[PDB]
Structure formats: structure tokens, C-alpha cells
Symmetry: D2
Subunit: 476 residues, 4 copies
């Protein structure tokens, strides 16, 4: 026997709904991954119909002629309820319509909050007042931003926690669903070869990279209020750091894994400005098309903006495993490439017998693009003398990340979602730096659209212990 | 200023000379790797000329039309001296002819002894008596067999050492010149990633393999007096064990490396018969051609022979690094493939959190064929659940071994040559077992030409701690 | 400015109150360790006065003539309220009397529950209804037993947690306040010398001992319903195991330490009967006085009792640090001595060069009696030959445990108190074994009053890997 | 059956003979430690008799009335032969007298060379010409100095090795016979607790100390030609370093142990002057008696002498175990105390949770005086808060060193004697510094008789990584 589920999309008229949520639920229904009795209920202020949602989402549905019957079966279970986000009568009508569905009283209710955070308090409070199922479970999906600093995020989290349990709150982060990011735990904890070296005695530095080759591309005003740190560092690179640095969990249960992640975060001190390099991209006169416009060339960006589109920060995990190992978090927009990557550079071999010709070993876990795991190491040069040369061992070798995250919410797996204590630790790490940046308005270092970013970032990486050589040559 | 060298080939009328030594010296001269003033002097009882040696060796010379001028310049420096191996007048004529060469008194003398060991004592004694240079160095190349047990090898080694210093004796082993075998030291000692796990705390077992797909192929009588242990185990697999197990040398000087090798050998106890599996191949009735003949089907093999063409022995290195780790030496003829390989199987990960789905990590160093280094490890299965699957990191990417060994003798590098103490340790490890085999004449386990050998070998490997799974699937 | 405190002793007419709680609070007041404004309020059904409590407790007060003025100042702040444990009017009178005290509305209320657990639900529920301070904090001290199995303890813990937060509940364990037990964390985590060896690669087995030289001594009927496992193993030895085995906490905050303890407990599987040895002491005919009576010789013990007065169980911590290391928990009554002790026996040295003369190293942390830390190790025998002999490095060198525990409740430090999740993990480890014991009624192995207990316990320790030698000689 | 032995003392008229060698052989004969058939033969230019040797040595014999019969039995086996050290007739008479003894042709001959090194070449050459036994073994005991630099020591060693095998040469060092020095190997290699931490990952620095509280005390002229480095550092502290730093030998055979020692020495680079602090003691005006005279106050010391009576040098063992760990060698005369000591200071604990209150662990092996092994570590302060305090684990608990060294020469054990390669490595480490000192004549830093020496030595120790605290309080 299988229970019925109601997927309540609140804010279904928004861009996020039609472009990502409705197509994702459609793909999950197409492959039979959803529970059989799944009803999708929209909820927004705009007066639309299921026909309107179909019309605005089918270009993103990737709907091919073959499964048109399944398409019209999908919107058969779809429905819409118009109402306001702070009007109790609208929530009463929403609850009645959910109860008007087949087996709507014992159904599991999954609320996806595709709304700006400005209405999150009211939406969550009203959902807890009137739209909570008395038999099935009730889980809410919350989207970023989760506040802008420690205080505002703490306010929002305390409000949501005052109504919902931690097992009901799913703060969705699309990177925690990516294949390499989830493979990190198997790589670290299923293998003997990576166990004894994964510590400060063998690792010189850890580099976590998130590069984008495109700038703000028109919507620079929305980016201006947050900046690169809040946008990327505070969530993506910090989750990456937690996965890289965490102790082995007692089990693969979500609670144990998130316990280990928050335990790592609690061992990190607040970031100091001397360990931070900020940059803001400028236009490329030799660039072609969109690369010629700088961050300030966007009309929506306020004039004189000091918002950083690039950041390189050094964190330290002050515990037994990691003491003294710099964790370099590097992210930026309008850079030379797209790349999300974990790099461990190992210490020199103690007692070198090859006359300083050896290079530091490196383990690279490239999350994207073209997922790869390779370790740069030394091998004998084919020849006559005893000279090592750099080589590498390369790892050789379905629903996407968002689909699997939604499936996880369906199955109640919370390992790939940000816990409240994890969020608060993340905000406390970066809040003094964010306040200093907002207060002093330091001028970011300009860098040209399509470059690697400020050179001061490379200087900072070199200063904290990373050594780039440039002698490693690789051919596919 | 460069010194002149005399390459004295004694036994130049033999098969080894014409088929390997003369072509190798030819190839070294062709590429200008030899010293400019190098004279090759043959010496044997048969009355031949340089024309005869050219005629019998040119099919093996791989002489192409282009370098015929260099060919005739090569035999210009060639010469021959007929004489007996125990006649002092013949050695006087050899010395006079060497002195009759240009700068023949201050030349470096390199004596390759391409003779059966039965005359080694007389040849070395006479060389030391009359043909030793008073200005340049004198180095002798000695070929296997180096005795048949501890006592005979000790006799021969004591006689040679009574006349020559260790820096003058080059016991040539063609496997110590192979690329992967020499890459073992760089792989172990130039890389941080292989350092902390290369010990008993992480390695469950070490497997050293030497397989040949062909049998004795006609000359079974010569093999009958030695057997597979003396043929392969006592030198090839034992050198492989020394390279795998040795501590890091103080430097890359030959003396330090061979010191580490003999230090490893001294920590090995004598082999017991319960850790030995012996086999002798039989014919394959479904085989095609030469595979249908068994070891005893060779007319040159004495009837009722119990000579083993296969052996699997377990050794233990009783020291701090390796205590309790079984070293499985596996070699055999007429097997299913050609392969020389080093396999390290690592222990299970302690505190498994993946519900016993993990497989033991393995590091494989395949010396031949198709040199490869790969490590079998666990990675997340592309899917939805948290299941690891077996994968592997693969290493991705000139004069041959004999040429480089001869070049090493020219440059005086002795690290790829068996030292006397190393030879004596090797013989003391295996001599009780060899005496037991010769005394009791145990019947070897038959196995069909072209198979993997006796099943008792797999039982022994499983008993000492190796676990084969068969679930690892690999595709190129 | 310092807040006022009310120490509410409920069940003040009981033996525990007059013999331990009132004297402990008296000694804390004598040395000025309590807050200056501290009022002690008794509460029980028996109609007594402060004079009666003084009369029944002064023999235990250790009151010397010098501080009689402080004695009569102490009972000046003392008061008593008679009432029933489930009568709301009595709790109203208690609350009014607390409010009738000076600054009784903003005072911090500390409820020591010196009552049998049968009334704990009613007492806690009524305290939460009516006697909870609205300004100061409210903390309750709960005494053992904390249930009798997983189910009943879970019932009681869920009821208490339904009214009080974890930061308000103090489950008091007098052993967590002992000096060596608290020194375990400093010894493990403040010292480099004990860090790298505190793992499965170096430790062969861990022995946790709790021996008493006296039997049930008259009150055998009370012991009969619980047994040695519930009495000692489930709390004392398990807390000792958690301290020995835990990972390093993120900090010395109580929450981090108890998180590490519960993380250790979660990695322990349920005990199997084959890893359990049970004993029940019999009388000693050669004993003198009380040693001649067996466990069943007590008239209060039901006839045919199979209650175990001795237990030796082996636990395993299935995690990365401890996998395969047996944890031997050994406790018993009427044994040959009093002793609480932690013993780590280390593995043999790998690659022994002293011809098997070496003994396993041992680290001993004796909690009581005569607190000591010593490590048994090998030293050269004073003589001529190269023979090691066993020696040892000995560690060389205030309010008692209950006083410091009560002070901890005053300061709000919860590190030495059992958390709810820790309690439920402890109960789930032992509950199947306890149910099997109460169901099958296995006959315990008799052992004579004053001996070391059953020999089967020594057999079990030897079987799981501990090796006793008896060659270690020590003189003071 | 036991062989006869001849103890030939050459230079028997010297102070060393009568004061140390004759009494030591007397004590060995008194306790029956020598072989039963042992004959002591003196040899010197001065014309003395056995009565004269008895008269000049009995005050040092410690001869008590009880064993006067054994005394006169001892000189019954004593004899003397007068002769010159370069006259062949004298050695012929010595050989004839040895043959004139009972079983003097098959006796084992033990030559103690109690002569200044100026005659060593002649004495050894003549002994090898005429006084070598043809049946028994022949071993020579050689005393320091073993040259003054690399070249002179190499000359002397090449001369002695040209006549004697390494198994015949016993370069006696009285410190290698001391109890703690020999206990170093058992402490390091018989114990698990000292194994995994004995490396660069755990040890911050190694301090080797040799302090004397007395100056040159009259014979300053003899000290002037050598200095403190040659006197103490080049042998005592370097042997101590080898024992501390060496890898585990394959066995306790002398050859394996000395192989490990020379392997350590080969990994040490030549000392640089910036890692050297030199001092020369001056008189103490507040001193009493001999402490008031400085090094230059000795009339036998040449005026303007720059000879160092104190030295503190830092060495580095560039290998896998020790890379980057400073080895501080500290020795000096006229200091505040007598002390020979090995101190290992360990690194800070990684991830400190005790708010920087922890001190570095230390392992101290005091060779003399009052042999002790103790480890300074952190323990909980008896009190209320979580503060560690420094404490220590103390180790708690026959022929002397020279007697056991002579016995070792009798039994042929060479582990406590300097091998030739070890001597040459020791000289090559210090020779550039010694030549620089002799060439530039740097002025040593004055320090007062009875102090700890120059403060620059403490500055150097602090600079290379040792941290002295002064907060460690110890009471017996
Ligand atoms: N390619 C190979 O066959 C090969 C491979 C690996 C190792 N080896 C080793 O290298 C050595 C060279 O042997 P080989 O292959 O050259 O065999 P071989 O051809 O029989 O010996 C070479 C020459 O030695 C002389 N000779 C043969 N038997 C003799 C005897 N009883 N007394 C004195 N002289 C004798 C002969 O020259 P004269 O008649 O002119 O005197 C013969 O031409 C062997 O010990 C073998 O174990 C050989
Ligand atoms: N020293 C110790 O004995 C000791 C040691 C360790 C742990 N503990 C634990 O601490 C708790 C305190 O027990 P205790 O030693 O004080 O025993 P107790 O003296 O029998 O109990 C204390 C008081 O509780 C009241 N009481 C007793 N039985 C009751 C019942 N059935 N219903 C309601 N009230 C009852 C009585 O006061 P009124 O008659 O005035 O109501 C009695 O004076 C126990 O649960 C025990 O397990 C005690
Ligand atoms: N106790 C110590 O003094 C002591 C301590 C440690 C090491 N050592 C070392 O042990 C060796 C023994 O020296 P020692 O203390 O015995 O000094 P020593 O008494 O001067 O020398 C011993 C004997 O050697 C002979 N001799 C002295 N100078 C000579 C010369 N220039 N040429 C030939 N023969 C000479 C003398 O005997 P004849 O006059 O009869 O020939 C003298 O009695 C020394 O090299 C010293 O470095 C000595």
C-alpha cells in the first residue's frame, strides 16, 4: 500500500516554478519516479489556470510528441488555487481544495516555497495554521537566500523552527545533489588508499574552486545586494569544505552526516580580511559581445557599487585532523572558465632522494564540467637516468541533481539539505567580514572579463602555502 | 678527454653472444651510446673470423641498408682471439692482442662472460692472472645460473670475490633493467600518496606474479636440472619483492639501494613446504599444436621427472613494516598468459558504513605486457542510492633493458645487478626447500597447458589472506 | 550582582537526603562554594521540622565545635514543607513558601529528586505545573535507576523531556565526578604521547574494571530486581568506555563532549550472550564473619534467585578508530578487592628483534583506590646481555565528587551528567541481553566470596585477545 | 673446552694502563668473568717488573685484605716484556715470550693499545708482522683520538684496515658501554608506546646534552690542541644521536646495529657555522678555589688561545623519519652541573581544546647522573575547572662500563665500538667546521665557570624550534 502525496507549489506563477519546478515534477512523473497518487497544486496571487501553466511551462517541459497522453494525464492531477500570501481565507480555500482531492486528508503534503523570502514568515505561519495534514507528514522546501547575515538568517530560522521540526524543513541546495559532490563521501570513506593521508601530516593545502565564465548578464541589480560571498562562498564552497574535511560519520543516516558537517563548521574561526581577496570584473575591450561590458556597465547596478564579483578567502579548520592546513575558497564570475573543483596538494616527500626534482602530489576532484578524479604524482621518466616526472592516475568510466533532490524530499532523506545549526555556523563564519565590507566599502580589485581574476588571489594562495609550478603537462 | 674501452666477449661463438650480445653492442654503437674508442674482442675455442661472426649475427643485427657504412665501421673495431679457457698461453695471446690495440694498455676492460658456469672459475682466475688492465678499470659481467643452491653458489661467489672486488662484479639480471621495475623506486619514494599506506597497517597481502604462456618448448632437459624456482622465483620474483618491501635508501647510490634490498632479504625466514604449491604442466588435448605436448612429452626430459614448471610460495618479511603480511610469489610456465605484475591488496576499511558493499583496494603495477599502474578503488554508483562500486585510477601516458644494463656496466652503476650478499640471502631463503624437493621428489600437481595452473595455488593464496572477488569489471 | 537560589530537596525524610544531600550542601555552604543567597527547602509527606532534619543529619554533617555558628546560620536558611507527591494543593503550598522567601520569585530553583522513581512522573509533572520559576532557571536532579530496560527508561525519559529541556535535566552519576574519570580527557587530548597510539593499529584490547570486595550485605532484595549489569555495567563501565573510546570533542563545552560520547555509543552493537560471563557469589567457609554468607544466604533474596552479582561482557566499537578492538567490561561484588580501572593492552611490537622476550605494553588508569596512571613497558635488564625486562613509568604527585557534581548543577555544567540519547543508547546496547537473562533464567557461575570471580571470565578475556602473563613484578 | 687468551697491554707503564686497564682486568679476574686461561703481558720501553706494576696499580686495584691470595694468583699470570715500539727484535721477543706461555701458540691474542696515536701505525704494523696468532683470533683495542680531522683519521684508519679486518678492530668508546645508552635500543624497539611517535610528525626537536662542572683542571694544554668538539661532540653526542635517530635494525647483531648507525650518519649534512655557538669558560671571582681560574689562566694553555670549551651545534637528519627535526648537540666544560641526557620535545597537540594552557610533551633519558627515564605530560589539575597542569611519568626501579666493554672484546661483540665508516661519516660531518675554526680563529663567547654557558646557545635552541617554559615544577 502506497500513500498519496500533494505537491503544493506556492508561487507557481513565478519564473522558478515554470522553468524548473513544473518541468522537474513532469520528468519525475514521466519516468514513474513519483508516488503513483501525486497531486500538484499551485498557489499564487495571479489568476491563472492549468492551461496557462501548461502554456508557459511546456517550452521548458521538453515534451516530445510520443508522451502527449502522459502529458495530459499529468495536468489531470494538476490544479491551481488563487489567493494571497497573508489572507487566511485563501489558505482555508487551499486546505479545502486539498481535502477535496481524492484521499486528500491522509495525503502527505510537500510544500515547495517558490517565493521571495520576504513572505516566508507569513507563508510558513499560515501553512502551519491551516494547511497541515493530520495523518501524513508535512515537509516544506525552502529556497535561498537564507537571510543575509547571522542575525536575519537567525530570525528567519527561529521563526520557521518555531512552527516546523528539523525533520520537516528542507533547505534546498542544488549543489548537494551533484554526482561528484555526493561521490566525495564514498571516495573518502570507502577506500583505504585515501584514509591515512587525509590529514594535516600529509596535506599541505586544500583548494575549493567555483568559477563561472559569465558575468551578471543583465540582472546585476539583484546580484548587487548579495555579492559573490553570499551567492557562492557561504553555501557551495562551504558545503564542499564540510564534505572534504569532515570526520567519518557513524553511519550514512542524514543526521550523522550533517552532525559531522556542523562539527567541522564549529571548528572554523571567523574570517579575517587579511585572508580575503575581493575582485569586481570589468569589461574586455578585446572581448566579443557580452564580455565587453563590466560589472558597473549594467544599468541595474547602482553607480559606485563596490560589490565583489570575485572572492578568494582562506579558512582554517582548527581540529586534530586539519590544524594549520589552509582551506582556500576561490569563486568568481566572468572568469576564464566554468569549473567546480576540489584540489588537495600534499606535502613534499620527507627526505627527498631525487635532488629536489619531485613535485607535490595533488588529488583533484572536479565536480564540473566533465566530472573527473585524478591524482598528480611522480613517475620515472622513460629514459636512462633516475629522474622522476609528473604524471597522473585518472579515474576512468538518469535524473539530474534537482530531480534527485526533490525525490529525496519525497523519501525523507535530509543529507543533501542544510540543517539549521549548519546554516548558523556558516553565517557566523562570514558575518564579521560581510559587515566590514558593507561598512568600509573597500574597493574590489578590477579584473578583465574572461581572465583568472585578480593576481592578489594567486599571491594569497602562494602566501598560505600552495605552490603552483606550471611544469605539469597533460594531454587527453 | 674520454678513455678507451675494450669489450671482451668470451664465448663469442655461443648462441647468447651472436643472438643478444653482438646485436646489443651493435645497437649501442649505432646510436653513439658507447664510448667513442670501444673495441670488441671475441674469445672462444672455435676458430672463427670477424666475417663468420658477422654472418651468424647479422640476421639478429636488424641491419638496414642505410647504416651499412656504420656496420663495416663497427666490425673494423671488432677482433677475435682463438684459445682455450684454461690454457695460459691463450690468455697471454689475448692480453697481447688487447695491448696491440690502439691505447690498449690504459683502456677500460669489460669482460662479458658468455660461457656456461662450469668454466667460470678458470676464466675468472686467468683474467685476473694475465688480462687485467693496470690503468683502467676491469669489470666482469657474470650470467646466471649463479650456483644451484647455497653451497655451490657460495663456492663460486667466494672464488670470484677472492679475485675481484664487489665494484668489479656485475651479475646481470635482465629484469632489473625493465622500465616498470625501475619505476618502482620512483613510485614508492617520490610520492606522498603511496608513503603512509605502504605498511602492514594498510596492506593485507602482496602478490608477485610471473606467468609465461609457453612451456619448455623443446629444451626441457636444460630446464629439468633447475626447475621453476631456481629459474624464476629465486631471482625475478625475489628482486621484485625486495623492491616492493625495501625501506627508503639513504640516496640513489647503488650501494645504498642494494643495502636496503639485502636488509629486506635478511628479514625473510626459510620457506616451509606447507607454504609452497608446485605444479607441472601436461598437454592440452583440445590445444592446437605445441599446447598438446606435456612437460614429460619432451624427449629431452628424463622419464619420471618431478620437476616443477609452476610454483606458488608465500614469504614473510619479519620486520616493523611488513610483519604478518604474506608475500605470494607465483610463477609458472605454459600458463594462460604472459604477465609480470605486482599487486598490493589493502585491508578492509575500518568501521565500514556502506553495509559490507565495499571491496578491498588494490594497487597493481604490471611490469609486462603493456606497462600499467592502476589502483582499484570504490566510487559512488551513478544512480540514486548510496552504493559504492569498484572503479580504478589508471596511470596514463629508447634502448631496451639489455642495452641499458650494458650501458650501466659501462658507466659503473651497479644498482641493477645482484650483489654477493643479496645472492647468498636469496639462496639461503630457498635452499632447504630445494633440498627437500630434490630429496623427497614430491609429485607436482598436473595442470593443463594454457590454464592458470593448479587450483591449490588459489587455495593457498586464499588461506594466507588474499581474497579474490571476481566482481571487478573492466573495459578498455 | 549575584542571583538567589533555592535548593528544593524533595523526599528530604529519606536516607539519601539526610546521609548525603544535606551534609553535601552543608559542606558546600561551609566553604562558601554555594551562592550567597541559597535557601534549602525540604519537601516530603512525613511531618518533620528543621530540628528533626538537623538531629537526623548532624551525625553525618561532620559538624565540629568550631563552626556551630555557621551550622545554625545554615539551618536558618533551611525550611520544610509537608505535602503529598500527587496533591496539587501541596505543590501550591510549596510554591507559595518558595515565593514567601526573600527574592523567591526571581530565584533559581534547583530540584533534587531524592525519591524512588515510582513517583518521578507525578513529581516532575507537578513541578512543571506549579513550582517553576518565571525569571530564574529551573534544573532538576534525577537519580538512578533510569528505568529498567530500553522501554521503561524511554517512557520515563519521554515523560520528563515532554516537560523539561535537556539543559534543565541533570541525571546524576557520582562516578562522572571522580578525579581520574575527569582526568581521562586531559590525559587523552592534552598530550601528544598518547595521541597516535590511541587506536586499533596499536591497542590489542581495552579492559574496564569495577570490583567491590563486599557483597549485597543485607539489602540483597533490592539488588535482586536489578542485578550487576543494571547496577554497574550500564552506567559506570559504559561511561568509562565512552571516555576511553571517544573522538576528540570540538571543545570542552558539555554539548560537544556528550555528543562524542553518544557518537561512540551509537557505534556499539547489542551484546551477545556468548560474549557474557555471569556469576553469583557464594559464602566462604574459611571466610571470617560476613564473607561466609552467600548471595542466597540473604533472607531478603528470593529463593532460587539467578541474579548475577558478577558480569564480564565484551563490547565492540565498530568505527574507524576501534574496529576489532575488544572492550572488556568486568564488574562484580564480593570480589577480592575494590578497584575501578582502565587498562589498555597494546599489540606486540612488529618485527620483534629480542627473541620473543618482549611483553605487551600496557597503560593503566586506576580510578580508585589510590589514583594512579602507569604504563608497563620494556627496559634493558641491568646486566651484560641484551634482554629486556618489564618495567613501568609511574605518574608521580578539596570538594569530593558529589560536592563538585552539585556545584556543576549550580553553574549549569552538564558534561558529567547522562544525556537522554546517551541513556537510550546505553539501554539499547544491553536490553536484548537483559531480556534473555530474565526470560531464560540462566544459572550464574558460583564463585567464592573474596575471590576474583568465575574463571570463565578469564577464559573469555583470553579468548577475545587479552593475554595475562603473571611475570610482571612490582614493588612500591 | 675453553681457549686460552693473552691480554697484551702495550704501553703498560702509562697512566691509562695502571689507573684503568690493570684494575679493570683485575676486577674481571676477581669475579671470574675472564676466561680461565688468561695471561696479561705488558709491553713498553721503560724497564719495569711485575712488582713495579703491582706497586703503581694496587692503590687503584681497590685490593681488600680478603682476596690477597687471588691478587698474587693474578700477577702469577702477569708478565712484562721491555722493548721499543719500532724495533723488530723487541716484537720478536714479545712473540717468543707469548709462545713461551702455556698454550701460547693457539691462544687468542687481545692487544690493548694504551699508547699515544703517534706510534699506532708502527705498533699495528709490527703486531701484524710478528705477533699475530696463527690459530686463535687477534683483536686490537684502539683508543681515541682517532685522528684530528677527516684526512688524518682516514690515513690512520686506512693504515689499520690495510692490516686488520673490521672484525678485528675495536675502537673503544667508554660511553657506548653505559647502561642508559644501551637501554636506548630496548626503550625504542621493545615498546609499542614509543614507536609511532618517534618521528618528525610528532617530535619538534631533539636535545643531546653532555655537561661537565669542572674545567680543564691543570692539563689545559692537552685539551687546547683538540677542543670540545673533537673531545665530546664528535664521539659521545654523535653516538647518542645515532642511537636516538636510527631505524630499527634487522637484528641485534653488531653489524646490523652499526649499519643502522652509519645509515643515520650518512643522512647528516656538514655543519654550518650559523648553527654553531662556541664558548670558552672564564674564572669565577665569586667562585671558591678552582672555579676562580679561567681557561686561559692555565699556564699550559698557549696565550691568546681561541679553543672552545663549550659548543652547541644543530644537526639535521635529512631522511623520511627526521626531515626538519633539529638535533641540538650541547656540550661544555666548567658548567653548572654534570649531565648526559637525551631530550625529545614533542609538537603541540593539534587542535588544542584547552585554550593554549597545554605544554609540549617531553621524553627525557638521563644517562647520568642518577639514570632516569621520565616523560613530561599534561594532567588535570586537582580542583574544579578543566585546566591541565604539567606532570610526569617516571621510570621506577655489576661490572661497570669499561669492564663490560673489555668483556665484549673478549666475546667478540662489536656493537659498542666505532666502525670505520661510522668514524669517517662523523669526521666528514664536522671537518669543514673544524677547519673554519682553526683558520679564522673566531673568538669564543666567554662564560663564567659554573654557569650554564653562553646565552647565545639558548638563543640558538629557541631559534631552531625548542621552547623552554620554566613553568615545570618537580619535587622528589
Ligand atoms: N641466450 C641464451 O642462451 C642465454 C640466456 C640467458 C642466460 N644465458 C647464460 O649465459 C651463458 C652463455 O651460454 P650460451 O647460451 O652461450 O651457451 P653456449 O652457446 O653453449 O656457450 C657459449 C660458448 O661457450 C663455449 N662452451 C660451450 N660449452 C663449453 C664447455 N663445456 N666448456 C668450455 N667451453 C664451452 C662454446 O664456445 P667454443 O666451443 O668456441 O669454446 C660456446 O660457443 C650460459 O651460462 C647461460 O646460462 C644464456
Ligand atoms: N543513599 C541512597 O540510598 C541512594 C544511593 C544512590 C541512589 N539513590 C537513589 O536516590 C533515590 C532516593 O531514595 P532513598 O535512598 O532516599 O530511599 P527512601 O529513603 O525510601 O526515599 C526517600 C523518601 O521518599 C519518600 N517515599 C519513599 N517511598 C515512597 C513511595 N512508595 N511513594 C512516595 N514516596 C515515597 C519517603 O518520604 P515520605 O515518607 O516523607 O514521603 C522517603 O523518606 C532512590 O530512587 C535511589 O535509587 C539512593
Ligand atoms: N687515562 C687516560 O689518560 C686516558 C683516557 C682516555 C683515553 N686515553 C688514550 O689512551 C692512550 C694512552 O695514553 P696514556 O694516558 O697512557 O698516556 P701515556 O701514559 O703518556 O702513554 C702510555 C705509555 O706510552 C709510552 N709513550 C709515551 N709517549 C710516547 C712517545 N712519544 N713515543 C712512544 N711511546 C710513548 C710510555 O711508555 P714507555 O715510556 O715505557 O715507552 C707511556 O708510559 C692515549 O692515546 C690517550 O689519548 C687515555
Amino acid at each position: 500500500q502506497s500513500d498519496t502525496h500533494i505537491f503544493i507549489i506556492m508561487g507557481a506563477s513565478g519564473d522558478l516554478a515554470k522553468k524548473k519546478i513544473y518541468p522537474t515534477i513532469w520528468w519525475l512523473f514521466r519516468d514513474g519516479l513519483l508516488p503513483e497518487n501525486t497531486f500538484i497544486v499551485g498557489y499564487a496571487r495571479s489568476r491563472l489556470t492549468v492551461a496557462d501553466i501548461r502554456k508557459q511551462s511546456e517550452p521548458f517541459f521538453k515534451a516530445t510528441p510520443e508522451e502527449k497522453l502522459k502529458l495530459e494525464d499529468f495536468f489531470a492531477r494538476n490544479s491551481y488555487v488563487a489567493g494571497q500570501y497573508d489572507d487566511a481565507a485563501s489558505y482555508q480555500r487551499l486546505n479545502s481544495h486539498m481535502n477535496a482531492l481524492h484521499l486528500g486528508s491522509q495525503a502527505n503534503r510537500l510544500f515547495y516555497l517558490a517565493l521571495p523570502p520576504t513572505v516566508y514568515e507569513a507563508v510558513t505561519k499560515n501553512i502551519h495554521e491551516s494547511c497541515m495534514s493530520q495523518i501524513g507528514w508535512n515537509r516544506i522546501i525552502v529556497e535561498k537566500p537564507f537571510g543575509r547575515d547571522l542575525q536575519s538568517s537567525d530570525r528567519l530560522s527561529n521563526h520557521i523552527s518555531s512552527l516546523f521540526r528539523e525533520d520537516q524543513i528542507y533547505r534546498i541546495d542544488h549543489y548537494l545533489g551533484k554526482e561528484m559532490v555526493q561521490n566525495l563521501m564514498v571516495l573518502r570513506f570507502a577506500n583505504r588508499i585515501f584514509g591515512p593521508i587525509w590529514n594535516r601530516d600529509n596535506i599541505a593545502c586544500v583548494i575549493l574552486t567555483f568559477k563561472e565564465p559569465f558575468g551578471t548578464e543583465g540582472r546585476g541589480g539583484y546580484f548587487d545586494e548579495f555579492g559573490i560571498i553570499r551567492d557562492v562562498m557561504q553555501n557551495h564552497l562551504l558545503q564542499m569544505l564540510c564534505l572534504v574535511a569532515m570526520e567519518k560519520p557513524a553511519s550514512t543516516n542524514s543526521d550523522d552526516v550533517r552532525d559531522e558537517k556542523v562539527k567541522v563548521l564549529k571548528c572554523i574561526s571567523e574570517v579575517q580580511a587579511n585572508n580575503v581577496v575581493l575582485g569586481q570584473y570589468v569589461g574586455n575591450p578585446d572581448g566579443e559581445g557580452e564580455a565587453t561590458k563590466g560589472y558597473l556597465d549594467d544599468p541595474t547596478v547602482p553607480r559606485g557599487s563596490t560589490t565583489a564579483t570575485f572572492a578568494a578567502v582562506v579558512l582554517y579548520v582548527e581540529n586534530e585532523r586539519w590544524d594549520g592546513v589552509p582551506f582556500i575558497l576561490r569563486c568568481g564570475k566572468a572568469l576564464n572558465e566554468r569549473k567546480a573543483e576540489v584540489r588537495l596538494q600534499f606535502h613534499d616527500v620527507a627526505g627527498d632522494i631525487f635532488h629536489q626534482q619531485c613535485k607535490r602530489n595533488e588529488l583533484v576532484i572536479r565536480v564540473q564540467p566533465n566530472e573527473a578524479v585524478y591524482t598528480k604524482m611522480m613517475t620515472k621518466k622513460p629514459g636512462m637516468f633516475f629522474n622522476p616526472e609528473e604524471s597522473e592516475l585518472d579515474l576512468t568510466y538518469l535524473p539530474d541533481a534537482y530531480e534527485r533532490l526533490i525525490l529525496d524530499v519525497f523519501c525523507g532523506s535530509q543529507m543533501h539539505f542544510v540543517r539549521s545549526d549548519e546554516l548558523r555556523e556558516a553565517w557566523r563564519i562570514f558575518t564579521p567580514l560581510l559587515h566590514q565590507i558593507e561598512l568600509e566599502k573597500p574597493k574590489p580589485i578590477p579584473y578583465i572579463y574572461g581572465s583568472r581574476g585578480p593576481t592578489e588571489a594567486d599571491e594569497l594562495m602562494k602566501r598560505v602555502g600552495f605552490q603552483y609550478e606550471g611544469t605539469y603537462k597533460w594531454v587527453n
